[PDB]
Each structure stands twice: as structure tokens, then as C-alpha cells.
């Protein structure tokens, strides 16, 4: 009666924001990329949460007694668990796509595969509930099995969260103009060179300048080219220098793609952070209830349920604040 209208407003906000995200990516071609495709899948998941599941949760928050059939409750609890598992696995897939884009910038079949895998795995995880394994008592609607609570926390939350944290750690691991100028100048010096001393000196300066860029394949190739010059093999050193130019251009392209993608990476990182912040107290109280025998009041359960549901509305705000083309598409579709 009190929270009834308030969470109705939250449901409407979630629906509007996610429909907005979906349309903005659907019509504007600046946003039509694979990672944004995964983002739209996540938005569809949140929309399904707000539309199909949240009304019945509001009904239970209002009347306090599930006054419908056991199959009704089983089906909609199945939908709840499946959509939330889909959300977290979509976040994991987005982390994986960001790692792929940053590490290996070198195509839609993979996107279709990941989207289908996310939904297939979520439906597989949530299957047991529709088969009557949820034995809820009369006029109550919960996950009535603690063992299934543990299994769902393990496969639906802990594994995807840990894998996503590790992938984003790998991404954070991945973190010079005068150096490129020096490299190219010494490359052309080797190209116009006619003896071995000039090539040796130029490759020495190239190795000195290439330490700042690498960690390194470029340095090893420079060392191989450098062995050639002590033996006086000028033509072989020049061929190695031509392949070195290829490697240097590849480095330039890679660190340009990386600088382009870092901003979207940061936006998705803060999205993941907000998701974890919203959904952490729920599982914290669950683990307390299980491994403590803590007499936890249901008010905390409902409060943390809704704290985790709030995350279904903050993703469009993050897309608006931390992205340019998304905000442009928003303002344009509004008029």
C-alpha cells in the first residue's frame, strides 16, 4: 500500500530507460557494435525483469501472501532467477568482449554465439524450478529450498562474478611519440644505409627507444637484426628492418585501438561496480542466514531485494553520463 505505488514508479522508470537504450542502439549506426549488442541484450534482460517478474514481487510486498497457484509461483520464480542469471552472465560476456577488443583488436558469429550461450546457460540453471522442485508452502512464494539457494548462489553469482573480476583484472593489467619518431628515422637510416656500422648504430638507437614502448617482440626482433650487423650482413639486416617497420606500425595501430576502447571499458567497469554494489547485501545476508543461523528479519531481505532491483534502472543513466553517442541518440530520439 505504501511501497506499492513507489515501486510501481520504479518499474515504469526501468521499462522506459531500457526501451530507450534499445531504440537508441537500434536506429543509430554509430552505436552498432558488438559490445553494444551485448549491452542491448542486457537491457532486454532488465526489461524482462521489470515487466514479467517485478509486478508479482510488488504484489507480495503489498499483500504478504501469495494467493495464486503453486505453478504460477514456480514459473515466475523461474523467470526471476533466469533473468538475473542472464544479467550477470551478460556482464561476464561484456567483460570478455572488452578483453578481446583491447588485447586482440584484430565477426558477428562470436557475438551471436555468446548471446545464445548466455541465455541457454541461464535457462539451464533455472530449469529445475518449473519442474516442481520448488516446494513452496501454501500462500507463500519463495525459493523454498536452501540447497537450491546454495547452488544458485554458486553457479549464478559467485562463478560469473569471480570470472568477470579476473577478466577485468587482466584488462587493468593492460596499461611515446618521440619514440616512434626515433624508430622511423632510424628505419629510414637503415633503408638508405650501405654499410654495417650505420645499421648497427641505428638498431642500437632503435632498441634504446623501443624499451619505453614494450614490456617484448619488437625488442627481440631488434636483437636478431643486431646480431646480423656484427657479422656484416647488411641486406639481411635491411630485410629484418623492413619487417621491424611492420611490427612498429602494428604497435601504433594496437595502442590506438586501445585508446579508443578504454572509455567504453571504463563505463562498463563502473556499470559492473554498481551492479555488484546493488546485489552484494542480498547474498551477504543469504550467507549469513545459511552459515550463521542468524535470525534475519524479512525487512532486510525485502530491502536488499529492492536494493538489487534498483540496479535495473541505473544502467541507462551510466550510458547517458559516460558515453557521447549514447547521449546524442537519446536527445535525438526524444525529439
Amino acid at each position: 500500500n505504501y511501497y506499492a505505488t513507489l515501486l510501481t514508479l520504479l518499474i515504469a522508470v526501468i521499462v522506459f530507460g531500457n526501451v530507450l537504450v534499445c531504440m537508441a542502439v537500434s536506429r543509430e549506426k554509430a552505436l552498432q557494435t558488438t559490445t553494444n549488442y551485448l549491452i542491448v541484450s542486457l537491457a532486454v534482460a532488465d526489461l524482462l525483469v521489470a515487466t514479467l517478474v517485478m509486478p508479482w514481487v510488488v504484489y507480495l510486498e503489498v499483500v504478504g501472501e501469495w494467493k495464486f497457484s503453486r505453478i504460477h509461483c514456480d514459473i515466475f520464480v523461474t523467470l526471476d532467477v533466469m533473468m538475473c542469471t542472464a544479467k550477470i552472465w551478460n556482464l561476464c560476456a561484456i567483460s570478455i568482449d572488452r578483453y578481446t577488443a583491447v588485447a586482440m583488436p584484430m565477426s558477428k558469429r562470436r557475438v551471436t554465439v555468446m548471446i545464445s550461450i548466455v541465455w541457454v546457460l541461464s535457462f539451464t540453471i533455472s530449469c529445475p524450478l518449473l519442474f516442481g522442485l520448488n516446494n513452496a508452502d501454501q500462500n507463500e512464494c519463495i525459493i523454498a529450498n536452501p540447497a537450491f539457494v546454495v547452488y544458485s548462489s554458486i553457479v549464478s553469482f559467485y562463478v560469473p562474478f569471480i570470472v568477470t573480476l579476473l577478466v577485468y583484472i587482466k584488462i587493468y593489467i593492460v596499461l611515446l611519440e618521440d619514440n616512434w619518431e626515433t624508430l622511423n628515422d632510424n628505419l629510414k637510416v637503415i633503408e638508405k644505409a650501405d654499410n654495417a656500422a650505420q645499421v648497427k648504430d641505428a638498431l642500437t638507437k632503435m632498441r634504446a627507444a623501443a624499451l619505453d614502448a614494450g614490456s617484448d617482440i619488437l625488442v627481440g626482433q631488434i636483437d636478431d637484426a643486431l646480431k646480423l650487423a656484427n657479422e656484416g650482413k647488411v641486406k639481411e639486416a635491411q630485410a629484418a628492418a623492413e619487417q621491424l617497420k611492420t611490427t612498429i606500425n602494428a604497435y601504433i595501430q594496437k595502442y590506438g585501438s586501445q585508446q579508443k576502447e578504454k572509455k567504453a571499458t571504463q563505463m562498463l567497469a563502473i556499470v559492473l561496480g554498481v551492479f555488484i554494489i546493488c546485489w552484494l547485501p542480498f547474498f551477504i545476508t543469504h550467507i549469513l542466514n545459511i552459515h550463521c543461523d542468524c535470525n534475519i528479519p524479512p525487512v532486510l531481505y525485502s530491502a536488499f531485494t529492492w536494493l538489487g532491483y534498483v540496479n535495473s534502472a541505473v544502467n541507462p543513466i551510466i550510458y547517458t553520463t559516460f558515453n557521447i553517442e549514447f547521449r546524442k541518440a537519446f536527445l535525438k530520439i526524444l525529439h
Epitope: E65, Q138, I142, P298
Partner: antibody, heavy 120, light 108 residues
């Protein structure tokens, strides 16, 4: 081997409150919902309500709302019923019982009962 | 509030006889009914659920039947251990309600 042992009999003055306990042994306490049932002097039975021990959630007979308060202690694996504002009509025997999972709406294992006598 | 009615509060039966205890629901409870037993020492035992399904550890002398609003428990042969009060309970809708109870006496 399952056993539900309830507290001793109560002799309470009218208006006061009382708290009966029901300690379970022989199964996972947090899985089976605990029902509480009244039996008046007239030998007739009434479903007071039930509590889900896992989530602490309760479902009451609308007739007993505000008269009964169901609580659990997972540590001691013990259910409790508290009756407030006791009148003569409240003196009866009170049973705890365990939700029969196989049979919907059935209680398979009952306690030995607790007499409550309201008298000044 | 489905009121359960047990036709006879008291009922006398000779030993080793066929006893039948009726139980009329105030509406169609659609065979959502259970039968409990309470011995003189107050101990309560679950005998039948779903109007015909024997609980674990109860003998085959007991059998339930019924439909619509009319249901019945039946003891094929009466043993002395079966002298007790039998209660029928409906779970078709909350709140769960019980019958008035039918207590058994030995005919002599």
C-alpha cells in the same frame, strides 16, 4: 529420529503474555515450516498459523493476528509462540507441528502439547 | 473459512468391526482433506493425506474416500489401539480448518 518437545504447562494471570517453546530434533530445522495449532477445552482444533524457519516469514490465520507471534531460533533450532493479552478464551492446549513436505497442507509430526490456563 | 462438520461426536463400535467416520465440508474442497488421530494421552498422529494416501507407518486397516463435500475414513477391523479421536482437516483454502472430532468407544 524426529522429536518435537514443547515447554511445560503455563498458569498465567489474565491480561499478561506467555511464550511457549517447541524444540525439534532429527532433521534439518530450517527446511520444514513449523505450524502452531490450538485445541480448546471443547476438543476442537484451530490452525493458529505457520512460520518458515529459513526466511522467518509467517502466515497467520486472520483470527489469531495480533494474538499470536511466531518466532524461531535457528541456533537452538526451536520455534516459539507468544500469546499476548490473555483472556479466558485463550486457555487451551497448544501444539507445534511439522509441515509434511509430501502432503500439501498436512502436518506429519506433532508435539506433546502445552496447556495454558488463564485465571486470576 | 470452510467449516468442517463431523456428523457424530461419539461413536460406539464392537472390536474387530468396520468403522466409518463421515466428514462434511461446507463447500467443495475438491478432495483436499487429511485425517489425524489423537490418543487419550493427547498425542496426535497423521494418518491420511489427499483423502486416500496412507502416511508412513500406519496400518492398512485405514482407508479414506470421498468427493465434493462428503468424505469418510474407514477402519476395516477395529483393534484396541484404534480407540481414539479422529479429526478431519481441509486444506483447500486458507485458513486450514478442522472437524469437530469423532471419538471412538468400545461397544459392550
Amino acid at each position: 529420529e524426529v522429536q518435537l518437545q514443547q515447554s511445560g504447562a503455563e498458569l498465567v494471570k489474565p491480561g499478561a503474555s506467555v511464550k511457549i517453546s517447541c524444540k525439534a530434533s532429527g532433521y534439518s530445522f530450517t527446511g520444514y515450516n513449523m505450524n502452531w495449532v490450538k485445541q480448546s477445552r471443547g476438543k476442537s482444533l484451530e490452525w493458529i498459523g505457520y512460520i518458515n524457519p529459513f526466511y522467518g516469514t509467517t502466515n497467520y490465520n486472520q483470527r489469531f493476528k495480533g494474538k499470536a507471534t511466531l518466532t524461531v531460533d535457528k541456533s537452538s533450532s526451536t520455534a516459539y509462540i507468544q500469546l499476548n493479552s490473555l483472556t479466558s478464551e485463550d486457555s487451551a492446549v497448544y501444539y507445534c507441528a511439522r509441515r509434511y513436505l509430501t502432503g500439501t497442507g498436512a502436518m506429519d509430526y506433532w508435539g506433546q502439547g502445552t496447556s495454558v490456563t488463564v485465571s486470576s | 473459512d470452510i467449516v468442517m462438520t463431523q456428523t457424530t461426536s461419539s461413536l460406539s463400535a464392537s472390536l474387530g468391526d468396520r468403522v466409518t467416520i463421515s466428514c462434511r465440508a461446507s463447500q467443495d474442497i475438491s478432495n483436499y482433506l487429511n485425517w489425524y488421530q489423537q490418543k487419550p494421552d493427547g498425542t496426535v498422529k497423521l494418518l491420511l493425506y489427499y483423502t486416500s494416501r496412507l502416511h508412513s507407518g500406519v496400518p492398512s486397516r485405514f482407508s479414506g474416500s470421498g468427493s465434493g463435500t462428503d468424505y469418510s475414513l474407514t477402519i476395516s477391523n477395529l483393534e484396541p489401539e484404534d480407540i481414539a479421536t479422529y479429526y478431519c482437516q481441509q486444506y483447500s483454502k486458507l485458513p486450514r480448518t478442522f472437524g469437530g472430532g469423532t471419538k471412538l468407544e468400545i461397544k459392550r
